[PDB]
């Protein structure tokens, strides 16, 4: 029996005019006996013939993986339209249906706070700048760092975590050479979320 | 056919004497025509007869699921012994192999840093006290907050995250009434990890 998994668009892609968001339908465990796969896509019940489909790809374990990618309108996703992938295959008496949507419930705007390196870390060679991001819903969110205008790439951020009030929070840690921080440079934690005004906010951090 | 998954013990369970860590072997998709399964458990290759197996598990899809739990002593696990589950089933041409053990690689002790609430959180009713815990390997760890010795319950901790050098970090967030932090109270971030020498380390944080 084949299996299908349905994936949402990347959070940033849904918030920028310059990006193009997509829902992805992945079909695994497709046999050599029946390698034929048909995709049908329905946006709130209405079929669309706009999905673009990749040729099948055999995996190490001798089964096939087939993926169908549907581009999405930004506002449709933000407004809660339901996206449905319908997969038919002869090893399968009735098609498989999977449906995806943005999460339900009142959006909540993130609060953003930046926290300097701890006092006890200044003996180390590099220091950690922390960005706390809390109180937001749904959990879709984008976080990056910039300095002097350009991006800063030596950072890692945690998955969102469910808080006690129903909101989410996460942390991001940007590590910089601690020569630079005592030198006095300015770094910025930049975050995008649908409940932010103009979709973004930024908070700065300096000695 | 039936499928097998083998799960390690819960992180708290490996770290305190008062708990009993266990390895859990789950078999899903076992048919009604052949519902009986045999479990064989091997500790570094030598069979042990100390595991407890619970009665079958009828699922929504009319399939049976079976779980057997092997309790393990802490020192074996930390010393790297391998645990092996062998599942035999008449609907299975050959028995199944699953083997689990503690994560491999040189252990490294966590570093603990406390970061006070951002001055801008001070307008809120509650403030966030954050504990950055970094540099540790393997990923099993216990993090809690207490004040005056007794525990603190409004806290949340992130999953471990792989840092760029192969070790892990996470953050823990304690929210207290902003009155509480102004009050002058002392809060403590307390952590246990197998690479610590004196069974715990703690760092304090106060106004």
């Amino acid at each position: 029996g084949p299996s299908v998994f349905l994936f949402p668009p990347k959070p940033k892609d849904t918030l920028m005019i310059s990006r193009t968001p997509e829902v992805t339908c992945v079909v695994v465990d497709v046999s050599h006996e029946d390698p034929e796969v048909k995709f049908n896509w329905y946006v709130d019940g209405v079929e669309v013939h706009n999905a673009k489909t990749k040729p099948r790809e055999e995996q190490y374990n001798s089964t096939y993986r087939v993926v169908s990618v549907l581009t999405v309108l930004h506002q449709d996703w933000l407004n809660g339209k339901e996206y449905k992938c319908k997969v038919s295959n002869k090893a399968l008496p009735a098609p498989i249906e999977k449906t995806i949507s943005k999460a339900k419930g009142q959006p909540r705007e993130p609060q953003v706070y930046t926290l300097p390196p701890s006092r006890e870390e200044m003996t180390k060679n590099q220091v950690s700048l922390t960005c706390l991001v809390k109180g937001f819903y749904p959990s879709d969110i984008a976080v990056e760092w910039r300095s002097n205008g350009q991006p800063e790439n030596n950072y890692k951020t945690t998955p969102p975590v469910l808080d006690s009030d129903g909101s989410f929070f996460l942390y991001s840690k940007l590590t910089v050479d601690k020569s630079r921080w005592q030198q006095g440079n300015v770094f910025s934690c930049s975050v995008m979320h649908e409940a932010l005004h103009n979709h973004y906010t930024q908070k700065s951090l300096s000695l | 056919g039936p499928s097998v998954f083998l799960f390690p013990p819960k992180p708290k369970d490996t770290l305190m004497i008062s708990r009993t860590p266990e390895v859990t072997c789950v078999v899903v998709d076992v048919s009604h025509e052949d519902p009986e399964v045999k479990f064989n458990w091997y500790v570094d290759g030598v069979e042990v007869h100390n595991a407890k197996t619970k009665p079958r598990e009828e699922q929504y899809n009319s399939t049976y699921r079976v779980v057997s739990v092997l309790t393990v002593l802490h020192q074996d696990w930390l010393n790297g012994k391998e645990y092996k589950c062998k599942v035999s089933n008449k609907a299975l041409p050959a028995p199944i192999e699953k083997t689990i053990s503690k994560a491999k690689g040189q252990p490294r002790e966590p570093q603990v840093y406390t970061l006070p609430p951002s001055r801008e959180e001070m307008t809120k009713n509650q403030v966030s006290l954050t504990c950055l815990v970094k540099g540790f390997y393997p990923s099993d760890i216990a993090v809690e907050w207490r004040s005056n010795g007794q525990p603190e319950n409004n806290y949340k901790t992130t999953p471990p995250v792989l840092d760029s050098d192969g070790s892990f970090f996470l953050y823990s967030k304690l929210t207290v009434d902003k009155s509480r932090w102004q009050q002058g109270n002392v809060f403590s971030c307390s952590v246990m990890h197998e690479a610590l020498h004196n069974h715990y380390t703690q760092k304090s944080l106060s106004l």
Partner: nanobody
Amino acid sequence: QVQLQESGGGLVQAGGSLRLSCAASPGISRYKTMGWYRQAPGKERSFVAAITWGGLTYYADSVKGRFTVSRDNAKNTVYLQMNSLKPEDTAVYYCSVDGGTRADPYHYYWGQGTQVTVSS
């Protein structure tokens, strides 16, 4: 029952060439992937090569260019064409039926093993 029988090992020389063969019981191989592994004394198992039902091939870095794996789907045998053999190729070689994904194989069945020895 379910068996895998290798054949073709033996004594070969540095720069020589050996061809292993591996025969599977009926069925156990159908629509499944076959791999070659090797084992020197005191050390452990290396991936050597593997080929899928569709014909995709995977090689360990140690043998790329030198070894070539091949398979006749209807004849239930897989081959390991070893060319230009070197001193560390000496080990006992096993064929298998594999699942999982190259980073983590699941071995359904194992062969008995054949010694390959290269002198200098």
